[PDB]
Symmetry: C6
Subunit: 196 residues, 6 copies
Amino acid sequence: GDWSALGKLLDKVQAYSTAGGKVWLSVLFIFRILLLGTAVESAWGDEQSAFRCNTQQPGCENVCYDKSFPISHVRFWVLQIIFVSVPTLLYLAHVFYVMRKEEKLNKKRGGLLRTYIISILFKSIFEVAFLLIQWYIYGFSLSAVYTCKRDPCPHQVDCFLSRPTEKTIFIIFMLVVSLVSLALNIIELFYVFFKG
Amino acid sequence: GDWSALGKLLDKVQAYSTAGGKVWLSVLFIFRILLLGTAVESAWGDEQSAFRCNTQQPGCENVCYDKSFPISHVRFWVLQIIFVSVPTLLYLAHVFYVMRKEEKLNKKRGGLLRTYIISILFKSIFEVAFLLIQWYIYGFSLSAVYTCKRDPCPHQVDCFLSRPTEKTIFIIFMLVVSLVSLALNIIELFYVFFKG
Amino acid sequence: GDWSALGKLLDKVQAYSTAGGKVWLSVLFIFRILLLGTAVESAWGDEQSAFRCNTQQPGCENVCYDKSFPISHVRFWVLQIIFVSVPTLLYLAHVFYVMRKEEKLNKKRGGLLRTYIISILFKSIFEVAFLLIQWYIYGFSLSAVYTCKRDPCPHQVDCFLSRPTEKTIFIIFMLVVSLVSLALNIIELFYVFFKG
Amino acid sequence: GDWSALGKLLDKVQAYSTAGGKVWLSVLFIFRILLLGTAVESAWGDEQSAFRCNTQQPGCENVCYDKSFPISHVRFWVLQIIFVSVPTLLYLAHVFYVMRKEEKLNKKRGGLLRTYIISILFKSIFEVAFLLIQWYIYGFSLSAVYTCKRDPCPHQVDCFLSRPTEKTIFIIFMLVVSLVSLALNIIELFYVFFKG
Amino acid sequence: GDWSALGKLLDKVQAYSTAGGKVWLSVLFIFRILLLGTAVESAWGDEQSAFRCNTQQPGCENVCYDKSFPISHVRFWVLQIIFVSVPTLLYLAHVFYVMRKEEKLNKKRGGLLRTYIISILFKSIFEVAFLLIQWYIYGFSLSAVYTCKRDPCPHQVDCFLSRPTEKTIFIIFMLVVSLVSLALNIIELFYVFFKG
Amino acid sequence: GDWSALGKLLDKVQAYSTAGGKVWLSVLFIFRILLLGTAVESAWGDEQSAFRCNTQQPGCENVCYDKSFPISHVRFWVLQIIFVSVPTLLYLAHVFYVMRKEEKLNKKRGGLLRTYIISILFKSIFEVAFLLIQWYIYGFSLSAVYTCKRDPCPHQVDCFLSRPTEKTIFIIFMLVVSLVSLALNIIELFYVFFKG
């Protein structure tokens, strides 16, 4: 019978947001987490043990793999999804302490407002900033044959990837769900801008 | 003593459905999840480490495996079962907020109806759409010997799969349970169409 | 203090059964689950990585293993134990909804009877049907040397299994516990037949 | 506040036992489970991948390993500890149903006695029966070099085990704790025999 | 309804701290734990199985790897994060016992103050001490080629690392979050110094 | 609201102990468990797969490894930490039964005293006994090159260990925390000796 303490808190945090934004944001988060957590991380299991190159020089594989993948995609998306959800839990833990400060007082405009919109700006700024770095570094497709020109390897070598087609589909999926989570925060911003 | 809050919610969501549909839908979901979760994912463990080909050209195995399996079946069925259950949890989280909006009012026809049938349509549309893509891409059987004609391999090579017979039975099982989940949603649609 | 809602449900489901059947069925289920879950699945770990054959033809091992094991025993027993316990949870979820339908009425013979005996028939029919297929396909012992006559292998090859003696004991154990679970359902059927 | 239902049940089951037997039996069970569950099962990890033999005949290792270990010790002790604790949970689930049968009556000598002593006999009979089979099959020590005389191997081969010294200490530990659990049940039997 | 016992304890422990320090310390802890727990420990999986050296002398790899990595970074950061959070849980368990000692009394300045500031000093001293050792031992970057001059290897050998670029980014991240956790404890110290 | 039953039990068990011993014993236990459970057991993962020796005789590695490590350190410390915490949980389960025996009486000096000090003696005796065996068997450092003189190997062989430097630091850490847990039990003994 002690679960009525949460119905205050979840209603107080969403006090300025529309009804069509609360459910759509919540479902895409669980969707993102499950798709990241059961399907795609097994695809990136043998990312180094299956990477083979066409040479005899010892150590050529270690450097020609490292030039191709300065970071993996599954560790990139975790770094993305943590930075995206930091400001929401910040706002959540802040509102709890503010409610605790006023709860102590009554028995024994613009205060929380600006903090909300600033967090909604920062969530979208981080999202578009992570999209730009992925556009700059990797691209949005993966070829099957890579050409490597590092040391200690000789002149030019060919290396063959591991599942170049299965990774492309999840690349496009994580592009699309990130674009939708950006586009919906834009609408949530314009809904609270146009009230007054 | 705080479990009576769920007896409202589970009764309010199924308010238009028949009694013979609630138990049959619920059992097949748990059946699907357990069969996906303990039996078949261990069969697809060594899907690449056991794939062998009859050649000496380095990198021929990596491309001749990738042409055969543009996506695996166990990652395909997870993508299927998430898209199938997205609209039900959407409807569930929507009804909670609508009940919260009216719960605040009384102490201090066609509204939810159309949203129900639209979700039941979308669940079946997604199911038949995923069946058609599986019919187009793979088939419904797996031979033991594959013939591969890609580059950098020479003219034509033979590759031998891993467990071609054990995968066929689970292919047919996931065909049958998907067909039954389609066929039962059809009856649930026709039951609510023919009232008026 | 909200656990008295389960004492109604567990008493209502077993209303026609004897006292000596409820405890014996419940203990063998937990016994089956634990013996399947901690002991025997580690024996079947290296079922393919330890399978070796006496040839040089590439791909001969992949087909000569697949002919010997069209399905594994641990995936067979999971498919058995799910099909065995489907009708009991079906009856359980049905009785909950029937109790919910009559619980709403009083404040604001043969109904459940036939459904019980039909489920008890189906549980035994599935059990004897799975025993017959195992008797037809595999046998009840495993030799140490298999002789294989498939393609692309030449005339006849010898393959050596992995732990032929440790699997036989668990084969006999899963035979015995299945026979006891069959034989006890027979007595539960004859106890309710001979009342009237 | 619903935890007072267990204080009836744990007091009713131990109604004939001494105070110095309840704590000593309970501690050795947890000790057995933890020592089986975190320490010794990692020692038996590479029991087949580290087993090497001094021959070139293919398949000689598979049969010469199987003759040496018709069952492993960690799967033997699980089969032991399940059979040991079956009668206690049988008695426990029986007493619950008997209490439920009499709980329904009062508001709206020798009965449980014999069942107790019979279970205490069976627990010790199973314990000494499992000790005798281990004494007959394996011994109580493991040498480092095994000599194997099976087919298809030639005349006599030498095989070298994996950790022959680390397994001996846990063999002696599981001997000692089993002997103590036998010896204490003997005292619990003689304590209830000599009352009258 | 028994969760009001924690609202006393979490308010009593933070009685001298500012409001802008409680949320920022709490978020960085969860951030540190998750980034340590799901992303970076998979990068350090194949730290020895992928380490290759350009020699034929047996055992040269074992010593030339060990000279390069006297401890790994992921085991270093766990040793850091335990020593950092020891004094906070010490203070927490101390305040519970002091509250229990005074709770027994009333029905049937500088006491806790000094213990707080001493713990806040020790947390920062440990943090800067761990930063100095990492600055002394390793550096803050990792080259791709190491030169090794130990025994039993001959004159000088070259060894090639595993992912020299992916580790550098997490090195810089764990530098930055540690520097921020140091810099914020400095402000928390100066806030309580300048009151009086 | 049923958590007040534990505040009796945790206060009754520590009735003779000082306030500065309860928190320090409790923190070192959690410290020991976590350091054993997440950091050091991954270091001892490849303890046999990375052990290499400089010979061609088959089976020489299996015996020359076994002579060097008659037991591993991580299995030694688990055997230590179970034997250390057996008497405390024995005393804990004993006090519960004694409280249950007197709880039944009142509504419908030296008793527990000696049992406390005897357990505190046994905890320290076991601790110093395990330190002496580790001092006798292994030492407190690990060299990088081992010299082995067993059969079936020839005259003398060299074997190279796996991480000789990373294990030494955790050896010294588990020495230090064990010495502190000994030294603090000595003070707890002298505190209760000198009362009277």
